Amino acid sequence: QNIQVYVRVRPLNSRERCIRSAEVVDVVGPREVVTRHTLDSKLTKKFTFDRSFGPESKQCDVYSVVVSPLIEEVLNGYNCTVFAYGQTGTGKTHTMVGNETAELKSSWEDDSDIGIIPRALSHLFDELRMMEVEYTMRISYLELYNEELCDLLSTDDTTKIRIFDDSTKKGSVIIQGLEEIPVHSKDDVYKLLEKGKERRKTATTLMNAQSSRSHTVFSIVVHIRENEDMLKIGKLNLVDLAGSENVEKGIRVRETVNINQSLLTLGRVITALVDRAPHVPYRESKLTRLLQESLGGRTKTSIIATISPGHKDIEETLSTLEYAHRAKNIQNKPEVNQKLT
Numbered sequence: 001q002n003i004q005v006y007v008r009v010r011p012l013n014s015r016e017r018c019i020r021s022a023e024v025v026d027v028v029g030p031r032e033v034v035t036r037h038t039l040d041s042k043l044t045k046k047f048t049f050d051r052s053f054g055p056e057s058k059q060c061d062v063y064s065v066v067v068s069p070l071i072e073e074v075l076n077g078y079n080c081t082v083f084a085y086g087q088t089g090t091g092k093t094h095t096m097v098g099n100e101t102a103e104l105k106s107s108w109e110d111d112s113d114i115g116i117i118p119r120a121l122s123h124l125f126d127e128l129r130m131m132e133v134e135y136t137m138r139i140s141y142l143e144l145y146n147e148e149l150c151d152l153l154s155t156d157d158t159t160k161i162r163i164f165d166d167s168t169k170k171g172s173v174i175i176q177g178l179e180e181i182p183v184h185s186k187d188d189v190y191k192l193l194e195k196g197k198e199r200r201k202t203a204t205t206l207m208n209a210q211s212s213r214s215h216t217v218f219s220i221v222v223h224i225r226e227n228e229d230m231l232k233i234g235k236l237n238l239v240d241l242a243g244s245e246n247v248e249k250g251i252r253v254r255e256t257v258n259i260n261q262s263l264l265t266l267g268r269v270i271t272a273l274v275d276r277a278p279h280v281p282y283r284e285s286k287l288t289r290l291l292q293e294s295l296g297g298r299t300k301t302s303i304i305a306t307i308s309p310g311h312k313d314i315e316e317t318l319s320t321l322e323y324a325h326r327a328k329n330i331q332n333k334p335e336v337n338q339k340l341t
């Protein structure tokens with residue numbers, strides 16, 4: 001019932017290659033990540049995860065290991081969350097979304113540059129197509145930008161988005177005004193993902209040309225009635241966080257301050273949970289209010305921690321690895337949502 005934690009090391013980029021950055025992070029075997037001393041190549045640190053993915057890792061294998069097992073749990077009425085977490089430019093958006101649009105034809109298994117969200121949509125429709133059930137699927141796509149909530153599937157600025165600390169699940173949130181769009185095909189959800197992707201707050205940064213300036217949550221909710229009639233509600237929350245940055249006026253700096261503060265709060269929440277501190281500071285950030293159910297709550301949660309292999313980034317990389325390594329100890333209490341019926 002623990003959170004599952006994974007690490008994904010991106011390749012050195014062209015600009016790192018040209019200045020010959022020291023590569024001090026290595027994936028060893030299927031689970032370990034090590035750091036190596038510049039001067040003698042001796043191991044300095046060794047962390048073990050549910051799986052570690054090196055710089056040659058493929059999109060289809062990250063999906064297969066991390067996300068494909070959760071599709072079965074969503075279809076069984078579990079709430080499931082995957083979130084990518086790590087320094088700016090380390091591969092969160094590559095991993096969670098990617099850049100290619102999915103062919104209405106492709107499989108989740110296909111070896112391509114497509115990331116998790118399109119593979120998960122494709123896989124869920126492939127499963128639902130074979131099930132002897134009635135189902136509804138509703139999509140929402142939420143952005144948290146400079147501590148304000150934005151609906152990426154709205155076509156105007158006409159509807160206010162508010163967050164309420166939750167109902168009988170007394171550990172959860174309700175988001176009023178967010179679109180929950182019914183979808184009936186892969187084509188329908190691909191067309192929504194593409195429209196919402198275009199609305200995301202991003203910045204053209206060197207080696208990070210679509211830097212995420214916001215946290216985004218893509219949520220899939222499935223109601224499944226078999227054929228007492230049994231109704232199950234499954235949820236899959238696919239979360240792309242904005243990246244931390246080791247810290248001149250302007251919106252850019254205000255974004256960096258808000259991103260770094262929300263991630264510091266997420267670290268405090270992880271530390272409080274693993275230390276067993278009596279107060280877990282979920283309410284200190286909108287991000288941790290959104291993630292509260294996923295962190296010690298009634299969800300199956302998987303974390304993908306993304307890191308750079310370069311010595312220039314080793315302090316940010318060690319922070320990510322240390323927070324990821326501690327989050328493996330978080331105990332969740334997943335429960336089937338079965339509203340009888």
Ligand SMILES: Nc1ncnc2c1ncn2[C@@H]1O[C@H](COP(=O)(O)OP(=O)(O)NP(=O)(O)O)[C@@H](O)[C@H]1O
Pocket residue numbers: 009010011055086087088089090091092093094095207208209210211212213241242243244306
């Ligand atoms: N595994 C990978 N293989 C090849 N290119 C990669 C990989 N991971 C990331 N990149 C590239 O590195 C750049 C930054 O990746 P991206 O996934 O957008 O970073 P990010 O962690 O989302 N950044 P940020 O949103 O600012 O925190 C992009 O041009 C990606 O194509």
Ligand SMILES: [Mg+2]
Pocket residue numbers: 092093094210211212240241242243
């Ligand atoms: Mg990003």
